[PDB]
Amino acid sequence: DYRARLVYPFSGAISPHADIVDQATLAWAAMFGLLTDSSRRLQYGLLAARAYPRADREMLQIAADWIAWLFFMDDQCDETGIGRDLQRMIALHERFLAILDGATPEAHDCALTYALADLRRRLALRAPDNWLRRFSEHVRLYFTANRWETVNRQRGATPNVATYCAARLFSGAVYACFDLIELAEQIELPFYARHHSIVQQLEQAANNIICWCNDVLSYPKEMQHGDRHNLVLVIQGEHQCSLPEAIDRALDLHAREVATFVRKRTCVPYFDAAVNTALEKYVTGLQFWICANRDWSLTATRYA
Amino acid sequence: DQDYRARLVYPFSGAISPHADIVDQATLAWAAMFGLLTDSKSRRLQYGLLAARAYPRADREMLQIAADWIAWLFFMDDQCDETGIGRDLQRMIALHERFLAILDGATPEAHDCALTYALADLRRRLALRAPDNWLRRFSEHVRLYFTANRWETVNRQRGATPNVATYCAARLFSGAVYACFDLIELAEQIELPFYARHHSIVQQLEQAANNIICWCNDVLSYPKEMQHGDRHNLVLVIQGEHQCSLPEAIDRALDLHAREVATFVRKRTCVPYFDAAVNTALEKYVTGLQFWICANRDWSLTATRYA
Ligand SMILES: CC(C)=CCC/C(C)=C/CC/C(C)=C/CSP(=O)(O)OP(=O)(O)O
Ligand SMILES: CC(C)=CCC/C(C)=C/CC/C(C)=C/CSP(=O)(O)OP(=O)(O)O
Ligand SMILES: [Mg+2]
Ligand SMILES: [Mg+2]
Ligand SMILES: [Mg+2]
Ligand SMILES: [Mg+2]
Ligand SMILES: [Mg+2]
Ligand SMILES: [Mg+2]
Numbered sequence: 001d002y003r004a005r006l007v008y009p010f011s012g013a014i015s016p017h018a019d020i021v022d023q024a025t026l027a028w029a030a031m032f033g034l035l036t037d038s039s040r041r042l043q044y045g046l047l048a049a050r051a052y053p054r055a056d057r058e059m060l061q062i063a064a065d066w067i068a069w070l071f072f073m074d075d076q077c078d079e080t081g082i083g084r085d086l087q088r089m090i091a092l093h094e095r096f097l098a099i100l101d102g103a104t105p106e107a108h109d110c111a112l113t114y115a116l117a118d119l120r121r122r123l124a125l126r127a128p129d130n131w132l133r134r135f136s137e138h139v140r141l142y143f144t145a146n147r148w149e150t151v152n153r154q155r156g157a158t159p160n161v162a163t164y165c166a167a168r169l170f171s172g173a174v175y176a177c178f179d180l181i182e183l184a185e186q187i188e189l190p191f192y193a194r195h196h197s198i199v200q201q202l203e204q205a206a207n208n209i210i211c212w213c214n215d216v217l218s219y220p221k222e223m224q225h226g227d228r229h230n231l232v233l234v235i236q237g238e239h240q241c242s243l244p245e246a247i248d249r250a251l252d253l254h255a256r257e258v259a260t261f262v263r264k265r266t267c268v269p270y271f272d273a274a275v276n277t278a279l280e281k282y283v284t285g286l287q288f289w290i291c292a293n294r295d296w297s298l299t300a301t302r303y304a
Numbered sequence: 305d306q307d308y309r310a311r312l313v314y315p316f317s318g319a320i321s322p323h324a325d326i327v328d329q330a331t332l333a334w335a336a337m338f339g340l341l342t343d344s345k346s347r348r349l350q351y352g353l354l355a356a357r358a359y360p361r362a363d364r365e366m367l368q369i370a371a372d373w374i375a376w377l378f379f380m381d382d383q384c385d386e387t388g389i390g391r392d393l394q395r396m397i398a399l400h401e402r403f404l405a406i407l408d409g410a411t412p413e414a415h416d417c418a419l420t421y422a423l424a425d426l427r428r429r430l431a432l433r434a435p436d437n438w439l440r441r442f443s444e445h446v447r448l449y450f451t452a453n454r455w456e457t458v459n460r461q462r463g464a465t466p467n468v469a470t471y472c473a474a475r476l477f478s479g480a481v482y483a484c485f486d487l488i489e490l491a492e493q494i495e496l497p498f499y500a501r502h503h504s505i506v507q508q509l510e511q512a513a514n515n516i517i518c519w520c521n522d523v524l525s526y527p528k529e530m531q532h533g534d535r536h537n538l539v540l541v542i543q544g545e546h547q548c549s550l551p552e553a554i555d556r557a558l559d560l561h562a563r564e565v566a567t568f569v570r571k572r573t574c575v576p577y578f579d580a581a582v583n584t585a586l587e588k589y590v591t592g593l594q595f596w597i598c599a600n601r602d603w604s605l606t607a608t609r610y611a
Binding site: 097130133134136137140141144145148160162163166167169170190191192193195196197200201204269270271272 | 436437440441443444447448451452455467469470473474476477497498499500502503504507508511576577578579582
């Protein structure tokens, strides 16, 4: 059993609002008409609960509804035709990007555009102008990464390990989720601290772990759809090796990346007591996400 | 004197655009038209000759925007560093609300000042040469530059001095170097994919190049910044933290500069192979960072600003 190797030298936590938030995410998905096929156990609110465990219910609900939105958007890209049609996806992302800027939805817009607009409207009530910009960009880059994956599928091109790993950092909107840690913990990190190279390298490390963990768990389902945007499948193509060896290599990178994150957590320079207090809350927020992603995915029927 | 020149060397060469002089004369004409020129050596500014060195392969239309942009930063910085607005957070937030609005595409009004009109002209001209995604990335780096200037204003107003770690982290934005680095894409006419543009090794090369440029400037600009009682300078910050002599601080400042050049060269060889086309485009961008490192050094020793 190779899944037992997805381990960390730290533990996670879950919000006491977990179930109340998850049932509210289902009501939210139903309201904006995101529920279509079949849908008893999605439990997208139970991932948010683990990801932002100290968050007040109102903020955790936005995060939960946001995580839900991403899963609905991802399933469309990876298991339907739009993920092989760039023209359709460009037309869709033009509407999303307009909604991110604060444009009101119109009669011709789809359910996902309406849903994103509500999340943007709600984030606007709880986040300052400077935060929305940083969120917009990370989400804008998330769309760009999906258009890139769409082109690869449409042109039948598989990227090398170097290219995939670089693109995979944006293709999961992990940086956009890490932004919500600021609102969840209610911290105002100053520009110099927020964008410091060590914080970036901690974010990059945390992002890789989360994504490479998911790649090990979701390779079977992505393989059946012929979607090779997966560390295991990209490694297999590059090294022309067996699937067990490809999994073994992916887990070696995961293990090495956990070590890097732990090593680099101690390399944060001292700015002042107040700023460093806020940073450890954010860096704790990263660790919560690392665990939240692994804890949920092993129990979730999605990778069964 | 020679001790400085031997420690401000780089293992790579710079270059200058053949359009240098007409671009500089046009920048002086542009500045005068928008009323950015103060009554006082107006021909001995040469803001165009920095741009020419910074973006040497750029077409004349593109280089001119960059030259007018560099001129704009210089006029703006002199306000924050050598006038009363840099000791008043209230007036600066009011001004910075107008700039950020102009960057979002807002038309200037009657009550707006010269710099607001000048920035609106640059955004309009950049909108004709750069796509939507580029303008966003430029706006952010310029927005963070404004925030960094507001943070210095607070430090001056309270009479507080940051430690080496705080200054070095904040100095990366106070220069608007990332905003200047964005123009390399338009200058070299390259389309770097998201994954290559925002890659960690590329980010490390940028902040390495940013540190070299800013720490080089600090070594040459501590005399005139000391006169205004401003300790936003690696030399003066190291002196404050260590409580050492001014020669010792300069030595420590040039040590960091020297090791950062060594880092940049080491990081340059660590860029992974994506594909022929992307690596070629990225090769042109990283060369652009080397041109900027030399441009800042070559110009500042040449210029009258630091004398
Ligand atoms: C899915 C998504 C964009 C957001 C919600 C899921 C979250 C927040 C999990 C963290 C790891 C990420 C971002 C991978 C999902 S993309 P994938 O195509 O690998 O997803 P899959 O393996 O099908 O679950
Ligand atoms: C004016 C400006 C922000 C940019 C022009 C110079 C450029 C583009 C080079 C990169 C390093 C910078 C910007 C430092 C000057 S800020 P400072 O207050 O230290 O300025 P000074 O040293 O007095 O020239
Ligand atoms: Mg996907
Ligand atoms: Mg998927
Ligand atoms: Mg997956
Ligand atoms: Mg300054
Ligand atoms: Mg100055
Ligand atoms: Mg200086």
